[PDB]
Design an enzyme around this catalytic site. Structure first.
Site, PDB file in Angstrom:
ATOM      1  N   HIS A 276       1.115  -1.270  -0.046  1.00  9.25           N
ATOM      2  CA  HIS A 276       0.476   0.563   0.141  1.00  9.25           C
ATOM      3  C   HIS A 276       1.059   1.819   0.211  1.00  9.25           C
ATOM      4  O   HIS A 276      -0.016   2.331  -0.238  1.00  9.25           O
ATOM      5  CB  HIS A 276      -0.994   0.152   0.989  1.00  9.25           C
ATOM      6  CG  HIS A 276      -2.207  -0.464   0.909  1.00  9.25           C
ATOM      7  ND1 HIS A 276      -2.387  -2.336   0.596  1.00  9.25           N
ATOM      8  CD2 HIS A 276      -3.515  -0.114   1.012  1.00  9.25           C
ATOM      9  CE1 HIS A 276      -3.053  -2.745   0.616  1.00  9.25           C
ATOM     10  NE2 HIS A 276      -4.343  -1.297   0.756  1.00  9.25           N
TER      11      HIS A 276
HETATM   12  N1  LIG Z   1     -12.235 -10.660   1.893  1.00  3.95           N
HETATM   13  C1  LIG Z   1     -13.601  -9.558   1.783  1.00  3.95           C
HETATM   14  N2  LIG Z   1     -14.823 -10.513   2.061  1.00  3.95           N
HETATM   15  C2  LIG Z   1     -15.603  -9.588   1.872  1.00  3.95           C
HETATM   16  N3  LIG Z   1     -16.143  -8.592   1.357  1.00  3.95           N
HETATM   17  C3  LIG Z   1     -15.133  -7.507   2.096  1.00  3.95           C
HETATM   18  C4  LIG Z   1     -13.441  -8.462   2.539  1.00  3.95           C
HETATM   19  N4  LIG Z   1     -13.001  -7.486   2.592  1.00  3.95           N
HETATM   20  C5  LIG Z   1     -13.081  -5.954   2.861  1.00  3.95           C
HETATM   21  N5  LIG Z   1     -14.466  -6.298   2.293  1.00  3.95           N
HETATM   22  C6  LIG Z   1     -15.445  -5.504   2.291  1.00  3.95           C
HETATM   23  O1  LIG Z   1     -14.962  -4.004   1.603  1.00  3.95           O
HETATM   24  C7  LIG Z   1     -15.190  -3.132   2.270  1.00  3.95           C
HETATM   25  C8  LIG Z   1     -13.644  -1.842   2.641  1.00  3.95           C
HETATM   26  O2  LIG Z   1     -13.829  -1.614   1.702  1.00  3.95           O
HETATM   27  P1  LIG Z   1     -12.698  -0.331   1.495  1.00  3.95           P
HETATM   28  O3  LIG Z   1     -12.677   0.546   2.627  1.00  3.95           O
HETATM   29  O4  LIG Z   1     -13.077   0.939   0.009  1.00  3.95           O
HETATM   30  O5  LIG Z   1     -11.196  -1.285   1.119  1.00  3.95           O
HETATM   31  P2  LIG Z   1     -10.108  -0.919   1.806  1.00  3.95           P
HETATM   32  O6  LIG Z   1     -11.052  -1.601   3.508  1.00  3.95           O
HETATM   33  O7  LIG Z   1      -8.599  -1.790   1.595  1.00  3.95           O
HETATM   34  O8  LIG Z   1      -9.736   0.310   2.311  1.00  3.95           O
HETATM   35  C9  LIG Z   1     -15.339  -3.191   4.059  1.00  3.95           C
HETATM   36  O9  LIG Z   1     -16.523  -2.647   4.623  1.00  3.95           O
HETATM   37  C10 LIG Z   1     -15.850  -5.090   3.264  1.00  3.95           C
HETATM   38  O10 LIG Z   1     -17.739  -4.667   2.785  1.00  3.95           O
HETATM   39 MG   LIG Z   2      -8.032   1.323   1.845  1.00  5.53          MG
END
Ligand SMILES: Nc1ncnc2c1ncn2[C@@H]1O[C@H](COP(=O)(O)OP(=O)(O)O)[C@@H](O)[C@H]1O
Ligand SMILES: [Mg+2]
Ligand SMILES: Nc1ncnc2c1ncn2[C@@H]1O[C@H](COP(=O)(O)OP(=O)(O)O)[C@@H](O)[C@H]1O
Ligand SMILES: [Mg+2]
Ligand SMILES: [Mg+2]
Ligand SMILES: [Mg+2]
Lengths: 192, 121, 121, 192
Positions: free
Chosen positions: C8
């Site tokens: 990241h």
């Molecule tokens: N392994 C996974 N399987 C299904 N959904 C997931 C998984 N990991 C994260 N998510 C979904 O992604 C969302 C987070 O999105 P986002 O904030 O854009 O990505 P990050 O967590 O990389 O910043 C969570 O609220 C969840 O619903």
């Molecule tokens: Mg993120």
């Protein structure tokens, strides 16, 4: 036993062996490390000898303390905390006794405490231990030192950067073991 | 409580701090990487510095390689601050500990979580 | 064989490649972090590119956080290059793989070592 | 069933909901993430709407593939790969059928395969599964979607960034579950 003058003599001869063989030590640190041990020790010992020149020592303990702090600051790898802690313990022992095996014992105990290495793990601990054993049996010699250095090749590295190589560390002489050989070989020359 | 990151690399130290700041804006956080010349390595002096720079008195500490750990150990023996040195992955461990700390986890719960990721450093 | 690091953070990626270059001067090594604008994040297009950019056809790959893994897994389904995604610590795992590969350890031997350090990401 | 026109209508409506709620989505991503879900989705969907303006699709499958590949490229956290895989699977399904429950099935399946999550793990999977069963039982509604969003607060996160907080993730609505709710409510608006 060591004195102010022969201690300074000893460390000067050690610095000389270190500067002379610096490329070789880093070469040893290539297959089983990051290729910097010689560079590390050259810096640390050049700085050590500089620091010893400007200071005026009341005793041997003071010398060892100065060595410990210089190596701890100026060496950026594992050999810094290791030699630094060896010298620090030797500094503390030297207040009460300058017996050679007692000093080496202090140093070994401190290296083992700091890096947690057992004998046979392919580190400088191996030669510190072998050298002390020899002193305790009145059989310490340059020949016996070189024997331990060569023997380091056959060992599996289980500590430090070398350990990351697993079986590929077998067949390579340990750089810290070699730099420790220079230390004791120069010690034997002035102390006998 | 605070978090201290020790790395052989100034760039890793800097990038990890930024990664962590996204999930832990308010925690007491120090990162140190490399030697005084920008070269790869760690020193007693710089580790000590990061420890004393941190506002907190109880420090959860993280490192990459064994020689960084040795410098943390040395500092721990020389400071009145209470250091815990965790034998866990640098990025993943520090990240876990910081996010939990931000969110109000107890020390005990954080340690409970870190015990779960113990690796042979 | 080749090593791909995905982070990241641009600085982690760069710091880690430098640390690794000290022990692996000759390996095929690609290290990418952050978004196009250098902000913390994971760009699929960069990951895809980095898999193409590496000169090797069998790739040992490493990531920091779960989303980075998903990009790697996506890319894996979208090339003929053989990717292995190692669910291990980024720094410690990539360092281990790179050191072993430089010293001429086999793929199987590297996998055996990395299996020892599996984490719950 | 969706057509080319109601698909474009759906996605425009979805984009509108995302833009209008981007701050709340990122806010939800605060206590259990890195506070960016709103900004990832806003970025991903404006780029998607730009992509749909400059193309002249011959079927719904083609629209889904374009969405899939834009979100993959332009959503920069975990949600990109997941929505991306969702729409890509839906693209393949849309070739044989435009039955809504069969599209959501294919989407749910690709999300589960991509992120490895099961129902009950505090992710968008929870609402994709609930929405699917709702369509199948002919009981899909906005109220039933808010039900599951609200219900995500009490789930322990065992996947994603949220999972690093352990029990500290309880009491917090999942941001991915919220953005998938907007997806589905805008779909119900236009599908009939
Ligand atoms: N392994 C996974 N399987 C299904 N959904 C997931 C998984 N990991 C994260 N998510 C979904 O992604 C969302 C987070 O999105 P986002 O904030 O854009 O990505 P990050 O967590 O990389 O910043 C969570 O609220 C969840 O619903
Ligand atoms: Mg993120
Ligand atoms: N845990 C340890 N215990 C004892 N000695 C060690 C340990 N780790 C490394 N060493 C010694 O340090 C030497 C390497 O020193 P150097 O190359 O200067 O440090 P680094 O490995 O950090 O680059 C090794 O050859 C070994 O003798
Ligand atoms: Mg070295
Ligand atoms: Mg080094
Ligand atoms: Mg997020």
């Amino acid at each position: 036993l060591l004195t102010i003058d022969t201690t300074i003599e000893w460390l000067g001869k050690f610095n000389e062996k270190i500067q002379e063989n610096k490329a070789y030590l880093s070469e040893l640190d290539g297959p089983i490390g990051d290729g910097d041990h010689g560079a590390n020790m050259a810096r640390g010992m050049s700085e050590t000898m500089k620091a010893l020149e400007v200071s005026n020592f009341g005793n041997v303990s003071e010398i060892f303390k100065k060595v410990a702090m210089t190596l701890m600051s100026k060496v950026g790898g594992a050999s810094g905390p290791l030699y630094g802690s060896a010298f620090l313990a030797m500094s503390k022992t030297a207040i009460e006794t300058l017996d050679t095996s007692e000093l080496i014992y202090a140093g070994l105990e401190a290296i083992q405490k700091r890096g947690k290495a057992q004998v046979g793990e392919k580190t400088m601990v191996d030669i510190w231990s072998a050298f002390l054993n020899d002193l305790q049996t009145d059989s310490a010699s340059k020949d016996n030192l070189e024997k331990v250095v060569k023997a380091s090749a056959g060992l599996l590295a289980t500590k430090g950067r070398a350990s990351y190589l697993g079986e590929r560390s077998i067949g390579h002489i340990d750089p810290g073991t070699q730099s420790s050989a220079y230390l004791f070989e120069t010690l034997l020359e002035v102390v006998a | 409580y605070g978090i201290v990151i020790v790395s052989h690399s100034p760039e890793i130290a800097s990038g990890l701090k930024k990664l962590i700041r996204e999930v832990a804006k308010n925690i007491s956080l120090t990162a140190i990487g490399g030697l005084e010349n920008g070269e790869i390595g760690t020193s007693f002096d710089r580790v000590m510095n990061a420890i004393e720079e941190n506002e907190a008195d109880n420090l959860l500490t993280f490192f990459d390689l064994g020689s960084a750990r040795m410098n943390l150990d040395l500092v721990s023996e020389m400071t009145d601050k209470e250091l815990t040195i965790f034998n866990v992955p640098l990025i993943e461990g520090a990240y876990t500990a910081s996010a939990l700390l931000e969110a109000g986890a107890t020390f005990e719960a954080i340690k409970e979580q870190l015990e779960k990721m113990l690796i042979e450093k």
